[PDB]
């Protein structure tokens, strides 16, 4: 059991530990425990979650939790504060004052309340004055973009991006482009126009996309299309149908997405696990939505693309056990039409579909059923679930009679199993065991009907796996593949090449290779879906060194394996990933006797991997990655991840793999890719950024994004990784451009980069450990942060400068000595709080570093040029000073002749 009470303390403590993500969750979760008979026990909480939320930028929340607390006590200065603090952030300074103001007089003195009000004051002033300044900025383009009045595409387009830029650029500008809904009908018009260029339309959706990231605005959007609520919810979803190009659909879905995020106060990209109360509040809308996205899971009128979407849309927002809606939805979804009907799809194909479907439509339904599975937890549940997939398998099977028509059913019950196997595999394998399936397997497998012929050779190819208990139906099935293999019908031949390729120890390991080879290689002739398997096959023949070498050995197999991805898209991910991931050895394995003789395979061990990775990344290998990379897979990502990570460890390579959407991908990977996915993808990011110019790799704010990762990847500093590769990055990042360092800082990441300094046997990881900080304090924020305070910093920018038994560590803390000197308060914290200061100043004085005896003589010269109690000090050091005064090469006499200057 658990008590309302204590649980809070758990969060209270979290708030203090700095896990607001936790705190938020803990409080909210705690809040659930109590009720409306434990009065005071609650308000306290709203107040506190609001604290954390405010800390995690959940402003709309902070505010709502805040006010939810005042609900009890008018006073609650704690609340009024946070609220106004939040409100002012939502760009709404108005009542931001009346809270902060009222707060102040409740807690008469409070450097905080005051600090805010000072701000809010300068705020309400530049309010009306400034809003009607934007409003115009807006209405001026609202003409160009929408309201007719604009000439030539180009401009109408630009005028849009602006609204978009201006839209998300500030919580304010958003409300500004929203123009109180004016935006909706204008965007809808671009949608409804048949001719309007796609991009135009997409861009205009993306403006709206953003606008509705606001729960209230969004929740308005949903209901705003018809007096009858339910009807409106239809309209929104069904927007993705108006048109039907890849992007138009995609860009649209997000709109639907927002509706979820808004409805249950959740956001998967922020890790904002839904507030149980909100969802529960406006629950009625969450019903209507799913219901609709579900009912269109089958409407034959609903396109394919759109279909695939309502599935992912379904996936991402229903699985409570994963960034989803609260618990309980996923259940009533299987307890009713949902599951069954989500299965009804699992048994469809592009060659027999009761409602539009595409080659890709499977993946989406696999993983999606796989998660609906996982998102079940309870036994009482898992039961009611299998006691359904089963109630399905029955009705479906007991209808597979042998006859022209009935045969349809075997294709269904068949595919229905090829999926169920790729998805919730357990419920799937635990299905082909009731061999009542194996006969039909044969029946069709031997008939004349090329289809049943092939999709039977695939209902097995898709049952290979690992263990047994299922090698029952495999027993007879493998041979069958051998027979079907002979077939002249390519489709049935290939679909047989797999499995018979996916086993191993006519079927020679090489044989099966030369097969998928010409099978594939044969571009112009053999179709695409044919080679989708030829790719899958070869893929299994890539876990053996020998073959790996053979593959890459032939250009045409790369030039084409690429060309395929550049067309098959997310249909060759799991596969082409394992091909690109295995020839690079991107896979990691845990690390009297012997067995070292077998760990050989020189084609695997040694820089023989590089041989491959080289001419491999030569033949696309990257363009191919970005290609079949769009796929909420998880592992496929993780695959292209290591396929990149292990691609950017060769220098001259990343020189182009950067120009081939490199930075983009592994970056996307950061968010999308699961587990090691992000992890290994980020290392790729960091291990790409180094001997690379940040101007030609991280422009357009690409930078700002490339921080949360390699500033969270540093955290793991107990040892390992490319923490160092992550330094030459933040070093080549915080360097040119302020804003950059801004994040690096806001990252709450300094407590760690501040230790690549505190090292001994780590010369290298310290070399940049400093070169970074030079470009970090390189512009206030952290400059005034390192001087005034009184935290033993300056103590080292001086030692390191002199302590040059190596170098670098100097040149870094040297120009980090000269520029930190020009500040007066600096010359203070030192001299008085820097014992044996001369001795140090002495070494660095002319220390044979033909550089530090210039950055030292400057960070030394200016220590006296400012403040005279220091200008005095001529004890021992003032000697060397005179030194440089001849034709002794090293121009270090520069900051040298400057040291003397401070004598006047």
């Amino acid at each position: 059991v658990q008590t309302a009470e204590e649980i809070r303390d758990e969060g209270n403590a979290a708030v203090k530990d700095q896990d607001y993500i936790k705190a938020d969750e803990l409080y909210t979760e705690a809040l659930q425990l109590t009720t409306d008979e434990d009065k005071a026990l609650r308000p306290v909480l709203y107040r506190n979650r609001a604290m954390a939320r405010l800390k995690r930028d959940d402003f709309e929340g902070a505010q709502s939790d805040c006010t939810k607390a005042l609900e009890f006590d008018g006073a609650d200065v704690k609340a009024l504060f946070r609220r106004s603090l939040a409100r002012e952030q939502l760009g709404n300074v108005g009542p931001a004052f009346q809270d902060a103001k009222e707060a102040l007089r409740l807690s008469p003195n409070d450097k905080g309340i005051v600090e805010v009000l000072q701000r809010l004051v300068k705020a309400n002033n530049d309010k009306i004055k400034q809003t009607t300044s934007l409003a115009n900025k807006v209405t001026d383009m609202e003409k160009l973009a929408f309201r007719g009045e604009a000439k030539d595409t180009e401009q109408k387009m630009t005028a849009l991006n602006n609204l978009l830029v201006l839209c998300r650029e500030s919580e304010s500008g958003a409300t500004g482009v929203w123009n109180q809904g004016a935006l909706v009908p204008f965007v809808l018009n671009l949608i409804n126009d048949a001719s309007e260029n796609e991009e135009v339309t997409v861009t205009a959706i993306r403006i709206l996309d953003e606008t509705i990231k606001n729960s209230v605005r969004c929740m308005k959007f949903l209901a705003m299309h018809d007096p009858d609520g339910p009807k409106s919810v239809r309209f929104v979803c069904r927007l993705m149908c108006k048109k039907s190009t890849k992007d138009f659909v995609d860009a649209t879905g997000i709109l639907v997405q927002r509706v979820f995020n808004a409805m249950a106060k959740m956001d998967r990209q922020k890790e904002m696990k839904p507030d149980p109360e909100v969802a529960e509040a406006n629950k009625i809308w969450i019903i209507r939505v799913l219901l609709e996205l579900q009912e269109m899971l089958q409407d034959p009128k609903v396109g394919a693309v759109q279909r695939e979407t309502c599935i992912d849309l379904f996936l991402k927002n229903l699985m409570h056990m994963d960034g989803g809606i609260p618990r309980g939805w996923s259940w009533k979804f299987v307890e009713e039409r949902g599951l069954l009907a989500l299965l009804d799809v699992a048994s469809q194909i592009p060659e027999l579909c009761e409602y539009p479907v595409s080659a890709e439509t499977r993946q989406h339904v696999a993983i999606c059923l796989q998660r609906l599975e996982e998102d079940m937890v309870f036994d009482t549940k898992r039961t009611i679930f299998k006691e359904k997939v089963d109630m399905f398998f029955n009705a479906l099977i007991s209808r597979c009679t042998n006859d022209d028509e009935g045969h349809k059913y075997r294709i269904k019950l068949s595919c229905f199993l090829i999926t169920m196997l790729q998805g919730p595999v357990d419920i799937g394998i635990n299905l082909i065991t009731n061999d009542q399936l194996t006969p039909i397997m044969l029946e069709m497998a031997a008939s004349q009907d090329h289809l049943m012929q092939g999709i039977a050779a695939e209902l097995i190819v898709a049952t290979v796996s690992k263990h047994e208990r299922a090698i029952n139906m495999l027993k007879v099935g493998i041979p069958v593949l051998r027979a079907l293999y002979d077939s002249e019908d390519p489709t049935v031949k290939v679909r047989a090449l797999v499995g018979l390729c996916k086993i191993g120890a006519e079927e020679a390991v090489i044989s099966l290779a030369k097969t998928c080879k010409k099978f594939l290689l044969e571009t112009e002739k053999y179709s695409v879906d044919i080679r989708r398997y030829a790719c899958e096959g070869l893929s299994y023949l890539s876990l053996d060194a020998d073959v790996k070498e053979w593959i890459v050995d032939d250009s045409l197999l790369l030039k084409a394996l690429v060309l395929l991805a550049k067309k098959a898209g997310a249909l060759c991910v799991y596969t082409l990933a394992t091909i690109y991931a295995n020839l690079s050895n991107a896979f990691e394995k845990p690390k009297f006797a012997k067995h070292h003789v077998p760990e050989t395979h020189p084609k695997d061990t040694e820089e023989y991997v590089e041989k491959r990775v080289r001419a491999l990344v030569e033949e696309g290998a990257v363009p191919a990655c970005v290609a079949v990379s769009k796929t909420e897979s998880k592992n496929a990502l993780e695959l292209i991840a290591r396929s990149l990570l292990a691609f950017a460890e060769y220098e001259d390579l990343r020189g182009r793999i950067i120009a081939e959407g490199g930075t983009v991908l592994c970056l996307r990977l950061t968010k999308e890719a699961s587990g090691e996915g992000k992890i290994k993808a980020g290392h790729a990011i960091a291990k790409l950024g180094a001997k690379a110019d940040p101007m030609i790799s991280f422009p357009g704010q690409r930078a700002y994004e490339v921080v949360k990762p390699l500033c969270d990847l540093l955290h793991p500093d107990v040892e390992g990784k490319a923490n160092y590769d992550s330094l030459l990055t933040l070093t080549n990042l915080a360097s040119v451009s302020d804003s950059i360092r801004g994040r690096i800082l806001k990252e709450k990441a300094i407590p760690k980069i501040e230790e690549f300094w505190f090292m001994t046997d780590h010369e290298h990881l310290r070399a940049a450990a400093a070169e970074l900080l030079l470009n970090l304090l390189f512009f206030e924020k952290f400059y005034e942060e390192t001087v005034a305070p009184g935290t033993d910093r300056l103590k080292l920018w001086v030692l390191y400068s002199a302590e040059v038994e190596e170098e670098r560590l100097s040149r870094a803390s040297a120009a980090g000595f000269a520029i930190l000197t020009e500040d007066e308060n600096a010359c203070a914290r030192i001299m008085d709080e820097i014992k044996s200061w001369p001795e140090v100043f002495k070494d660095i004085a002319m220390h044979e570093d033909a550089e530090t005896q210039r950055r030292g003589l400057m960070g030394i010269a200016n220590i006296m040029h400012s403040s005279n109690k220091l200008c005095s000090e001529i004890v021992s050091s003032e000697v060397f000073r005179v030194l440089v005064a001849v034709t002794k090469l090293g121009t270090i006499n520069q900051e040298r002749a400057g040291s003397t200057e401070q004598a006047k």
Partner: peptide, 10 residues
């Protein structure tokens, strides 16, 4: 010094 500077919960 402390934390009652309402940067603390309760």
């Amino acid at each position: 010094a402390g934390g009652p500077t309402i940067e603390e919960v309760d």
